[PDB]
Amino acid sequence: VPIQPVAGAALAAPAAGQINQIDPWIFQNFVQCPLGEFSISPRNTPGEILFDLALGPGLNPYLAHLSAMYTGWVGNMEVQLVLAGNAFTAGKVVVALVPPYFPKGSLTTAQITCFPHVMCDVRTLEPIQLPLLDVRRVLWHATQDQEESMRLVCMLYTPLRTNSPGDESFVVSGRLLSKPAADFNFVYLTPPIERTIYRMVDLPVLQPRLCTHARWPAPIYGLLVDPSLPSNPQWQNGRVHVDGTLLGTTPVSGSWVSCFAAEAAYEFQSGIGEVATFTLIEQDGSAYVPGDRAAPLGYPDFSGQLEIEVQTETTKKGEKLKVTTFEMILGPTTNVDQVPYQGRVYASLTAAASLDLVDGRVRAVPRSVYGFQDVVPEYNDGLLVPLAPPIGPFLPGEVLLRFRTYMRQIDSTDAAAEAIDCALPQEFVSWFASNAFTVQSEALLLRYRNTLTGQLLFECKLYSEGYIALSYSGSGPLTFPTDGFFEVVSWVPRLYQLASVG
Amino acid sequence: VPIQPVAGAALAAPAAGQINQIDPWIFQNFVQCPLGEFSISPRNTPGEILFDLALGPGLNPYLAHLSAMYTGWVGNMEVQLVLAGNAFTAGKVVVALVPPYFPKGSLTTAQITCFPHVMCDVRTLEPIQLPLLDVRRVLWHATQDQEESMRLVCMLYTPLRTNSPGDESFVVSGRLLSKPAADFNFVYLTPPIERTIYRMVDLPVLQPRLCTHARWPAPIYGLLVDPSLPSNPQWQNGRVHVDGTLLGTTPVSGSWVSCFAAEAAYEFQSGIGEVATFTLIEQDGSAYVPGDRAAPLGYPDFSGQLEIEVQTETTKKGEKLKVTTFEMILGPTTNVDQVPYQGRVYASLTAAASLDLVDGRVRAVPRSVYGFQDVVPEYNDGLLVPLAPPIGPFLPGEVLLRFRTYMRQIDSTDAAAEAIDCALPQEFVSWFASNAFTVQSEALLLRYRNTLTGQLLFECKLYSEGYIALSYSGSGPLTFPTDGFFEVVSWVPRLYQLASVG
Amino acid sequence: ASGQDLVPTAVEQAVPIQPVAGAALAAPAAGQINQIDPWIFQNFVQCPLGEFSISPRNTPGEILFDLALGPGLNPYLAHLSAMYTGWVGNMEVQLVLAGNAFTAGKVVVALVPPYFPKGSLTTAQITCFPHVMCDVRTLEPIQLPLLDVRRVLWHATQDQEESMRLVCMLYTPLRTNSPGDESFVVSGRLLSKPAADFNFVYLTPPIERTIYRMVDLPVLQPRLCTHARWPAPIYGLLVDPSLPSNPQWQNGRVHV
Amino acid sequence: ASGQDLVPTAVEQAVPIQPVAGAALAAPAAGQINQIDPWIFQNFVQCPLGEFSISPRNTPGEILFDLALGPGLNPYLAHLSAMYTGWVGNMEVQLVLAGNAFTAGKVVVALVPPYFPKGSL
């Protein structure tokens, strides 16, 4: 590889304050990078990204762990590329060594082998040693800011042409193994850092039956998946990123969901009467400016006829405490002008005599629906509205698992006619929006691990748009016991093949 | 100091696998221990614990941070004792060096100066160097198990006799500053450890207005403190430890609180009628065995007349969906046999014609009370019951701050007659019971820090029985704006003097 | 050993940081030669910041000053930095702590690095940073370095520094031993000089709108002024605690 | 010379008594060999007696403490003396006097001999 460096730590050692050794035992293990696990299948046309792995302390667990107490780092990493292919499987693969500040728009096959690359092979026997020496623009990189460093871009080249057996296509699975060289050493030691850009997402050890639902205030009763239900829903509560940035109407509260706070108005009673006008604000004493939330925070996002309690400061025949039914059409039937996007909802009062009600600041908890459908409510007059996007593209063998609760409703036709679905419940939404992790990949592997037996129930990938997918080939419903704590393994890439669910 | 050691790392270096250096810059800073900050006031009779600081990597932030990637450690620490006292303040103080496996039952003044101690003085000018060399019983200590190591016990001796000015008693504030010696080095490097016994409690960056209340399903509206209210309440929801061990009826859910799941029975209608019997179980499909929880998880813990919704599978005149009032006396008035401890509650049905109801598994969300009192409900017939203990002893200048919500109720006498109080809301209960920290002290300092200005609103200590205290000298109510994220500083001891609140 | 002393006359605690080699790095970068003066050096001169009065009514987790390294630590270098762009930094900073032999208390300095968050600097963050703790009673001026640990060749003199800071925290708060009702609020004026290595890199014209210039108030009289709330001359400046001293009046107020 | 001092840092006034040669006398008497410990030595340790608080409300003919020489001057020797019969005595006793530079006053020690009446001192 033509690079020819001379120095990478003695350059920054003057203007560093203090440069710090690590220990001579971390410079001797090849411990694998978090997201460089590739698999060359023979049904892959050549010229695709196998991995794009930067420089940095986020290539070992040890450097990422120790780099939370320093202010930065210099020095050169080293890579052992290993491939799980014996003979009779020809086909090259190139590890190009792309510099910092090279744009990522396109990288075809005539572009890989134009860097100082190494053209290795699937048939190789010994592992492949390769330096990743940081071409700086500055003296030392900082460790709390992601920075344009040297990246290692691997791509197959004269692709894999091998003989495959029955029902098992021979993938050549390759791994990267990073190790800092003798040039790698951190700079000035700053001890207090609690939250870091190299921390791993953790997904706490709360049980999925002990956690609050993120779409309706009920404990989660089921944890199932349906290929017969639509695999691409457009939910607006329980949407989150792993970054912590919320999406849509989602509150960081289990008590705010499917509820709203407003200023009431009780006006009309002239023979048919019985209506109320709620001017929406916010559920923690704030205002309402219509931006991108499509509704105030925690507004009920489903089509039905929701009955809502209320706090009334009624003058005559009772104290300042009586609740009532308050039917409220959330559904597509626009009889009254239902618009939570301007923040004006209308609610029929009660089958009552005439009227005795007083306006004020109210907060309207829900209690029952009449007919549930999993479509979005009309937020503005039937017109469009800035929504959270639908749940993104899956691998075609995967469907999203969902977390069943059960509303209480009025049906008079059949019992338990509906159930409420979400992904990443409110104890994970309030987890992600409070820790605010820094993501590496777009997907994130999990293992569902029950407590008192340790049996791996399923593995599942948690996409960074905040939904958990699961590869179930089938067309029937199936459930899972709700006593397993979710636990991470690694930031797996987008097109990852998690095994199966039987 | 008479100890006379010879070696403390070369003993364990044979049976270690690999011993690991740290770097030569961590062995040069005196960075202070987490819980050794003492203050000798002149109104302190001699013979009291100033600090009892063990050995271990939990004496620096750097050793506690780096010790999460090793399997253990050996070696000797070193202590710089500094005191903030100039001349004219005589009075000695002894740092005794107590061995491992010495019982902590009593340590009088004739017991301190009977170890290999150092008898230093308040009037000293240079700081006080002192070794803390680990008297092992084993080869290397492990780093994931707390272990009986050498402890440094400081105690005053011929006490402080100084001249004090007006309204400021001259405390001699002393600090300990730990640093590992050249003998300190870790052993075999095990990289993956996420949760550690040396991790610091963190208290996430959720706003107190965006968090769900832990006693009633409503968003927190106020954050106030009252010296006129009783400073020692006995709450049963929202009780937690920093350890993660829950106390009483507290669920790890915002939706389970003040609610219960049961098997219903609808029997009696004979002229006055209108009663239902709920046999309690659990709110996530479990049983109920009466142990120490005093009620099922999330049972409403307050005295009143709670009206609760229900899901009814009614045969005639409607579908399997209609909700109703269900008055239920939680209060001290034992008309019907109210007992959630055996799991049998009774609820008057409805001012209804006669009866049409069908038994089944129900879950009874609350909607309104008639008269709120902050006393515990009768859990078993008026008899006693294994309860969570009342909120523990404060420093006499401190009262617990509390988190206001507002129920909706029936009063017909006055509006907003009551408000609901808790400490550590459900987004901190579900935080502590999911991280499950390891505690060092009994108290834990916080700083209330508003977001868009950074103004320190108050400092407050979070006791390890799970309640936040606040030193407000006064007799009037005062509130705080609910937009400040709580942030920790250190594990302060029990008898700590946080400043004031004006 | 000048005065008669029941106080610590000497602090030299050997702050553990490698000496940075500034101004031999940015000499090939800039296309100029720029000495400053050999008499702006060897002259300790008070910074236009950081005059800190420690009081007994201060918690020990409280910050006295937080000086970012820059030319805004002398009148001289803040005067020259109106011309130039860029500088390469070293300083010798002397704290002048005062207060009688009847005071007490410590205070930690901390050379906190540039890329550290400007949020919580608690009491327990003294072992992490290269620090020197200092008694309040001390008689000599406390000299200590203030060097830069930077990733660039020079820091641009407008809002582009992100450089190394001195954080002082009172580590043990000021209890006095005097048997009187006397205010022992220890007033300290620290003062900095550039080292033998501070220089400016490139020479731009002075614009007078510069950051950290010497603020000044108009020298007229206070009775020669128009009242900013009613059109009348000021008939008297005064104080009165009996009036409500958190007023909500709108006109007459301006951020400086 | 540790702290800053307006106080007498040193007292060494050369108490005039011949050094007694104990424990080479009672070694032929007892029929045993009995060392104690070489680490009970070189460790100054508080006696279970004599903690004296001088006050301004004290006449100058008043006694602060009267320690008889014995093994009841350490926790160690009073613990070992539950086993043994007999001892041969020497001690180094350190008084720890305190009080600021604003105090005054003297205090005399006195090695009063054994066969002296326990009345008027």
Author numbering:
A (entry chain C), B (entry chain C): 30 to 531
C (entry chain B): 16 to 271
D (entry chain B): 16 to 136
Wording from the paper:
Norovirus (NoV) is a non-enveloped, positive-stranded RNA virus belonging to the Caliciviridae family. The common capsid structure of 180 copies of the VP1 capsid protein forming a T = 3 icosahedral particle is shared by all identified caliciviruses, which was first reported with HNoV GI.1 virus-like particle (VLP) produced by a baculovirus expression system in 1999. The VP1 protein consists of a shell (S) and protruding (P) domain. Here, using cryo-electron microscopy (cryo-EM), we show that the P domain of MNoV infectious particles reversibly rotates ~70°, in response to aqueous conditions, taking two different conformations; the rising and resting P domain conformations.
